[PDB]
Design a protein around this motif. Structure first.
Motif, PDB file in Angstrom:
ATOM      1  N   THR A   1       0.839  -1.192   0.000  1.00  0.00           N
ATOM      2  CA  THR A   1       0.000   0.000   0.000  1.00  0.00           C
ATOM      3  C   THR A   1       0.878   1.247   0.000  1.00  0.00           C
ATOM      4  N   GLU A   2       0.609   2.162  -0.931  1.00  0.00           N
ATOM      5  CA  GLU A   2       1.324   3.427  -1.022  1.00  0.00           C
ATOM      6  C   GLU A   2       0.352   4.573  -1.253  1.00  0.00           C
ATOM      7  N   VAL A   3       0.679   5.726  -0.675  1.00  0.00           N
ATOM      8  CA  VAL A   3      -0.077   6.958  -0.838  1.00  0.00           C
ATOM      9  C   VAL A   3       0.912   8.069  -1.153  1.00  0.00           C
TER      10      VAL A   3
ATOM     11  N   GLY B   1       0.657  11.234  -0.273  1.00  0.00           N
ATOM     12  CA  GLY B   1       0.852  12.044   0.911  1.00  0.00           C
ATOM     13  C   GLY B   1       0.291  11.424   2.174  1.00  0.00           C
TER      14      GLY B   1
END
Lengths: 17, 62, 26, 74
Positions: A13-15, A17
């Motif tokens: 999982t990556e975002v 910000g």
């Protein structure tokens, strides 16, 4: 056939910000 | 004011959950979420808000 | 009744401060 | 015998968790104990005092606890 499917990468999982 | 505060506090809750997913222990209780002075006080409702919005977002992603 | 009372107190104070800030911005 | 009775009472009071009972026995309870016991209860081994954490660590083998793995990873 000619194409060889790329073996799976572990999903993470990556975002931005 | 609530919409701004909620944006900030779901942001910080997302940060805590992303820390949890990487493996490191995070409490993930609303009391010990870090208050940023833009967030304000943490109620219990924003945990539910974050979960629901995250699920809807995951569904929305292409 | 008591629960509504504490909620109404907190809501009134927060709503007043928010209205003051919003008018100040406007 | 009296200390064994106290430890049995603590172990039972903490379900079957011998490590929390050992923390309660070493760190006492009330004045500095209960905050550390609650910290144990929510994971949160960082909040637990250093001496209590070491005491639990040296009791890891003999004591059975649901929190043994979490203390091992910590």
């Amino acid at each position: 056939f000619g194409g060889s499917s790329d073996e799976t990468d572990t999903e993470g999982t990556e975002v931005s910000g | 004011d609530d919409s701004m505060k909620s944006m900030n506090k779901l942001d910080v809750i997302d940060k805590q959950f992303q820390k949890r997913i990487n493996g490191e222990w995070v409490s993930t209780d609303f009391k010990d979420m870090p208050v940023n002075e833009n967030t304000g006080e943490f109620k219990h409702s924003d945990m539910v808000n974050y979960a629901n919005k995250k699920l809807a977002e995951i569904d929305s992603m292409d | 009744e008591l629960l509504s009372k504490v909620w109404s107190e907190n809501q009134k104070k927060l709503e007043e401060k928010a209205r003051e800030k919003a008018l100040a911005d406007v | 015998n009296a200390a064994a009775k106290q430890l049995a009472g603590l172990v039972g009071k903490f379900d079957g968790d011998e490590l929390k009972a050992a923390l309660a026995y070493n760190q006492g309870e009330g004045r500095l104990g209960n905050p550390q016991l609650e910290a144990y209860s929510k994971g949160d081994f960082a909040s637990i005092s250093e001496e209590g954490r070491n005491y639990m660590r040296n009791l890891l083998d003999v004591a059975k606890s649901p929190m043994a793995g979490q203390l091992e990873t910590f």
